[PDB]
Amino acid sequence: LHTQVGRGLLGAVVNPLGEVTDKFAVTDNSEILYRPVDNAPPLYSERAAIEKPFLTGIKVIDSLLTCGEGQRMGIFASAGCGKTFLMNMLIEHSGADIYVIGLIGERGEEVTETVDYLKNSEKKSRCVLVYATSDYSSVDRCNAAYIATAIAEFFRTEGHKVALFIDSLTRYARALRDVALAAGFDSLPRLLERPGKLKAGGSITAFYTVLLEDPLAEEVRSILDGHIYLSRNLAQKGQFPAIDSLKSISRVFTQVVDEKHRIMAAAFRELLSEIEELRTIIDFGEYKPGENASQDKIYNKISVVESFLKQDYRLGFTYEQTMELIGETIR
């Protein structure tokens, strides 16, 4: 019903009962406070409009799927789609004050893998990790999401720019339906309307992961402010991150980017639309060089478009670098 919060949790690993189990970093701050994990969502008059961009340092996201402060974004992918490597990039190359990661998923090895990454991360002093393995009860794995959110809500009340990660929403939904069987559902919507930007405080930008083998994918997609879709076909071809921008959306995109950005994003998106039609024409074996000047122009733009989309997971790009690169690729 109550969990521990405060800056003293920075660098700590929290289990489904709210106790510090391990540490990936130590800070000089010792503050520990207690707040309930089932907090009422902010009123509509309590929330501020989503207007400032949450820069991620990932070229395809910042340019075509720009996130906003307080936005809730979905990450849709199958297993082995590099969903974990994408969240490592989001934590590494964004600029949030505090990162709150909630793992309600897998086995001890995947949790330890996240801690091992955090032990060598540049943001370890700003990170909190709440975990729930397969060995815990369904009630405990549900509570790991509420503990992670309540921890993020305290930092937001202090005025921090908080990034919340929940991996995964479906293994929360699995634990959710198991809990419902004991009683004989609706904690999903109230859980993911808790993030946002407060007029009187900071903001929580939340990234929720759902796994594709789906009905649950259809429910969450209309609740969130957008979704990022990791095609493992794109991963099979060697493009990382495997984000397919043509099937992804940020519903606050035009609210948080300016007119010049919007125009370049539209020109790039149609360039990619013409690119994938050429891939179909090529796969059909009906592309002959020199026979169509428009197709030849599109063909010679494949390499520069492919290199703008691809990004080494250890490199981050500023907004001006991203806009500079997408400027060159559309000319």
Q: For residues 70 and 202, give the distance between their C-alpha atoms in angstroms, rounded to a whole number.
A: 9
Spatial CA neighbour of 99 closest among 205, 22, 6:
205
Q: Are 325 and 331 in contact (CB under 8 A)?
A: no
Q: How far apart are the first and last CA of the chain?
A: 57
| Displacement of CA 95 from its chain's centroid (Å) | 13
Spatial CA neighbour of 171 closest among 128, 136, 206, 124:
136
**Domains of the chain by residue range:** 1-257, 258-331
Angle at 137 between CA 72 and CA 124, to 5 degrees: 50
84 among annotated binding-site residues: yes
Spatial CA neighbour of 163 closest among 115, 113, 203:
203
Q: For residues 251 and 109, give the distance between their C-alpha atoms in angstroms, rounded to a whole number.
A: 35
Q: For residues 141 and 102, give the distance between their C-alpha atoms in angstroms, rounded to a whole number.
A: 10
Determined by X-ray
Spatial CA neighbour of 325 closest among 57, 85, 73, 53:
57
Residue 94 is given by DSSP the state: S
18 among annotated binding-site residues: no
Q: Are 242 and 83 in contact (CB under 8 A)?
A: no
Q: For residues 18 and 303, give the distance between their C-alpha atoms in angstroms, rounded to a whole number.
A: 49
Angle at 34 between CA 125 and CA 38, to 5 degrees: 100
80 among annotated binding-site residues: yes
Q: For residues 315 and 331, give the distance between their C-alpha atoms in angstroms, rounded to a whole number.
A: 25
Instruction: Give the DSSP H or E segment for 147.
Output: helix 138-157
Q: For residues 234 and 241, give the distance between their C-alpha atoms in angstroms, rounded to a whole number.
A: 8
Q: Are 316 and 93 in contact (CB under 8 A)?
A: yes
Spatial neighbors of 283 by CB under 8 A, at least 6 apart, are none
Question: DSSP of 210-279, one letter per residue?
Answer: EE---HHHHHHHHHSSEEEEB-HHHHHHT-SS-B-GGG-EETTHHHHS-HHHHHHHHHHHHHHHHHHHHH
